[PDB]
């Protein structure tokens, strides 16, 4: 099966790429696996596959860390993401995000039901598993629980059957047969949950599939529109209907090649202690436990030699930066274009801990609008910050056509030199805020509201007559023939490879 | 003579360090020298010494580019700056800035007059030179003139004789015997100029010395206090009285080992076209010429085989970042401490194009103040932004004791995650602004006023009871013994030198 359609094939792809280290000696899921993974993520090393996890019983489970993290070289920096999508490993960010957006104007390709698959190789019923006995990792030393769920896909369906959502929300083990986790607005698992609670008749039928098709985990992490079933979007994106099998204890459908599947219910009434957890923005607040959603597990099914993917998230760079930030930015780029805003590209700079999105503007189009900074900043912020795709983003930086928004250094340069603090900015206090950012949920103001800003790094003449400067750089402040002479004589004179 | 006290010895030091490329074939001062230098600065290469400059006559002149730019390795990144100051080449930024501040609580060591020196090896009077005939560089393709002065020291003295200031302000050739340049408030050359214009009797006696003692060019680029003679400060800093010779046509004194010396006057009445110039913030605005100050040159003296230093300034990283930013930040650190503010360290991040300064706070001291963010932000901004040392800085970022302000990545992390836009910031509109930043002089508001902000990246509990988080990083979210186990087994398991 292809790597983008089968997690087990994706692991083999990473090996073939010389992008995997298989650790076959005993590794402790209490911190050690996540510590190795953390170091990998902070150094852009090869992904670790822990084949000998202390506490692994009857096939549950091996761990793959850092599945969507960065490689060291510039030439295949995003290779692990490209391997989720059948793209060449040298794919640019622009090409990855375009591939993630491509299904947005295609008909869905709904999934195909098959009668069985590898996820049915083993099962454990209600008397045979205990979630406290599995090798679930403690990921950070102060975490409030063992976070079994950092890279699986929650599957829930609207009561009317019309929308089936796939999404990554965190969850940790509560006891032998329950998990707790975050289920918060405006996320789709929350939106569906609310539908079931207003009906008031039963808990939400639920499954959580780990080690799903890599193309499906990518869509699970992208804020595609309300009401859209991720399976059909992935089908369109990949040009192939995904094969799903039915759960044994409910009528939801899971990828046939899922490594591990939990089946059960998400309660519409119960809660339990959840968190704290070491989070995307680089922090944990020890002892900051709050009630979260409560899931009951009725059944586990799994592949022989099952592998659990894990995100050891925190400071730069991991799946929470490469996937949450970049995929939000892709959806925001589309959203702006559909609102007739002249945006060509969008990216969430890593240097902003993916809290900013830089929006590249077609300034020829801007000029024809015959508008001003104040008006244009307000229009952009109202579109993005009132939409779910803007949830996690607190600062939008508008830049002209000379800036490559996928290059943090150039975004930082533009922001720092072209946006006058205050005067060139519009603050938004009456929009939903992202409470996980420290300055929101542990800050001086309301955890759930405001704290957002549009910073205009467009220069004045970019609204009127056109760019009126040249950069004081080697590229722009010397003629072509001189530049080429310099480069051709560089090593000859005494001064100092693309792949490496 | 030691390298920090003699420019010619400093060039030899850079060679011995394998930090120099001597180019002995013909190089054009029309762009080519500055293009090579620009590339050096954008790639942290070795400093270029152009020994065969097309148009060099009767010893005037060779060029050294990139004299205060960065080296490639992390271990001696600031080595070229250390070589200005007799510090080991591995010196940290903290050690360089401490050495620049050390004279601030020492008695001055005034200079020693000697009867001659190498700067008197050759002379040209009023009938023998023509500044349009020398190999003065065109540094950027759209510059409004040939900028002879990018790394020399202007010397002017108060009418009462009590203060002699040394400073770098840019100047370009106007005609055979004049230069034009920037003389703008609040700079000391401007402050002295104003004194002479209010007396109204004569133009300002003036000299411009190129290739001065490296310790003296550093102090020339630092905003030490009003009224303080840079020579005595350098004397104290170095522990040695500087040797100066008298000018031939005026009574000012120049370093004895200066490579080239211009003697003349700065007019109290005349102006001439000046600029545009490719500037520190990374831009040139072609055709943006304005009247600047006008200098008359009456005499040139120079060393045999004289060498002119040159800054090919613009985008990262050159002398305008490493010296203007860092030395302002050092003076701001001192200024805050003298105003009883609990600041331990200050640095202007390169990523902010040296427009921000990050101030590290002793949060134990902050806690004893029993204050709030709003009050503390106002107090810090009022101290810094009303002082000359704050002129070039438009954003101050306050951070707690965990952040290394000399590490841009950590400053960016703190800013982006701990400062809530708007609410955690105070804007300052009634302070002097730096017009050279594009968003000031080519922006939407007053070029000379406002546009400044204090951004508080201190978390709430840092004012009260103490830090209440741990970072979600390898350093902080795993115990010591585990971390060390991981590191000791890293290459054994399969994963990947300080000098490289
Ligand atoms: C890649 C990624 C995405 C996480 C995520 C992480 C990763 C690695 C974890 C598991 C490591 C940390 C926690 N995560 C949560 C999360 N969304 C959320 O609501 N709660 C979370 O707890 N997301 C973000 C979420 O998946 C996106 O917002 C999706 O758009 C949700 O899909 P939806 O649009 O269908 O609601
Ligand atoms: C390192 C450095 C400093 C420049 C400088 C450059 C460099 C490389 C140039 C020459 C390449 C670009 C232009 N420069 C100017 C300048 N100050 C100024 O007022 N006008 C300028 O034109 N300075 C900043 C100035 O030297 C500091 O502000 C000093 O504090 C001035 O000394 P003072 O405190 O005694 O007035
Ligand atoms: K999704
Ligand atoms: K602007
Ligand atoms: K000075
Ligand atoms: K704050
Ligand atoms: Mn969805
Ligand atoms: Mn001075």
What would you note in describing this structure?
Chains A, B: It comes from Aspergillus niger (strain ATCC MYA-4892 / CBS 513.88 / FGSC A1513). Two copies of one chain form a homodimer. Chain A is α+β, with helices and mostly antiparallel strands and about 500 residues long. Chain A folds into three domains: about 325 residues, no CATH class; about 130 residues, no CATH class; about 40 residues, no CATH class. The first copy, chain A, is built from 14 helices and 22 strands. In chain A, strands 5, 6, 7, 8, 9, 10, 13 and 15 form an eight-stranded antiparallel sheet that branches. In chain A, a hairpin with a 2-residue loop joins strand 8 and strand 9. The longest helix of chain A has 20 residues. The first copy, chain A, starts with 6 loop residues before the first helix and ends in a 7-residue tail after the last helix. The relative contact order of chain A is 0.12. Strand 14 of chain A pairs antiparallel with strand 22 of chain B. The complex binds the ligand Cc1cc2c3c(c1C)C(C)(C)CC=[N+]3c1c([nH]c(=O)[nH]c1=O)N2C[C@H](O)[C@H](O)[C@H](O)COP(=O)(O)O (2 copies), potassium ion (4 copies) and manganese (II) ion (2 copies). The site of one potassium ion (K) has 7 residues of chain A, from strand 7 and helix 6.
Keywords:
binds potassium ion, binds the ligand Cc1cc2c3c(c1C)C(C)(C)CC=[N+]3c1c([nH]c(=O)[nH]c1=O)N2C[C@H](O)[C@H](O)[C@H](O)COP(=O)(O)O, binds manganese (II) ion, dimeric, eight-stranded antiparallel beta sheet, five-stranded mixed beta sheet, globular, lyase, homodimer, EC 4.1.1.102, 3 domains, 500 residues, Ferulic acid decarboxylase 1
């Amino acid at each position: 099966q292809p790597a983008h359609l089968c997690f087990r094939s994706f692991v083999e792809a990473l090996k073939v790429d010389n992008d995997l280290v298989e650790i076959n000696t005993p590794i402790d899921p209490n911190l050690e696996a996540a510590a190795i993974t953390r170091r990998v993520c902070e150094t852009n090393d090869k992904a670790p596959l822990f084949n000998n996890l202390i506490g692994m019983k009857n096939g549950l489970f091996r761990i793959l860390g850092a599945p969507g993290s960065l490689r060291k070289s510039s030439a295949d920096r995003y290779g692990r993401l490209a391997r989720h999508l059948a793209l060449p490993p040298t794919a640019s960010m622009r090409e990855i995000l375009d591939k993630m957006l491509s299904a947005s104007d295609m008909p869905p390709i709904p999934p195909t039901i098959v009668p069985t698959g590898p996820c049915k190789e083993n099962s454990l019923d209600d008397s045979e598993f205990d979630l406290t006995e599995l090798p679930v990792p403690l990921i950070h030393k102060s975490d409030g629980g063992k976070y079994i769920q950092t890279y699986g896909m929650h599957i829930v369906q609207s009561p009317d059957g019309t929308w089936t959502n796939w999404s990554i929300a965190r969850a940790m083990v509560h006891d032998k047969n329950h998990l707790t986790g975050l289920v918060i607005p405006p996320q789709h698992i929350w939106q569906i949950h609310q539908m079931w609670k207003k009906e008031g008749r039963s808990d939400v039928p639920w499954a959580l599939a780990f080690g799903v098709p890599p193309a499906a985990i990518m869509a699970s992490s992208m804020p595609i529109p309300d009401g859209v079933t991720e399976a059909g979007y992935v089908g369109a994106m990949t040009g192939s209907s995904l094969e799903l099998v039915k759960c044994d204890t409910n009528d939801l459908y899971v990828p046939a090649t899922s490594e591990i599947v939990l089946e059960g219910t998400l309660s519409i009434s119960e809660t339990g202690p959840e968190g704290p957890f070491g989070e995307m923005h680089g922090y944990i607040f020890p002892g900051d436990t709050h009630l979260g959603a409560k899931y009951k597990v009725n059944r586990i099914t799994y592949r022989n030699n099952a592998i659990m993917p894990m995100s050891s998230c925190g400071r730069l760079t991991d799946e929470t930066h490469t996937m949450i930030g970049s995929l939000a930015a892709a959806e925001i780029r589309k959203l702006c274009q559909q609102n007739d805003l002249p945006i060509t590209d969008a990216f969430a700079p890593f240097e902003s801990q993916v809290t900013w999105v830089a929006l590249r503007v077609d300034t020829e189009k801007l000029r024809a609008m015959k508008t001003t900074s104040e008006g244009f900043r307000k229009r952009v912020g109202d579109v993005v910050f009132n939409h779910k795709a803007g949830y996690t983003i607190h600062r939008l930086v508008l830049v002209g056509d000379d800036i490559d928004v996928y290059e943090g250094k150039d975004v930082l340069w533009a922001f720092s030199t072209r946006c006058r603090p205050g005067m060139d900015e519009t603050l938004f206090e009456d929009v939903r805020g992202f409470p996980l950012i420290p300055y929101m949920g542990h800050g001086n103001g309301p955890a759930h509201r405001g704290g957002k800003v549009v910073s205009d790094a467009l220069m004045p003449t970019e609204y009127t007559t056109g760019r009126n400067w040249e950069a004081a750089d080697f590229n722009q402040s010397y003629p072509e023939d001189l530049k080429q002479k310099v480069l051709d004589n560089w090593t000859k004179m005494g001064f100092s490879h693309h792949h490496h």
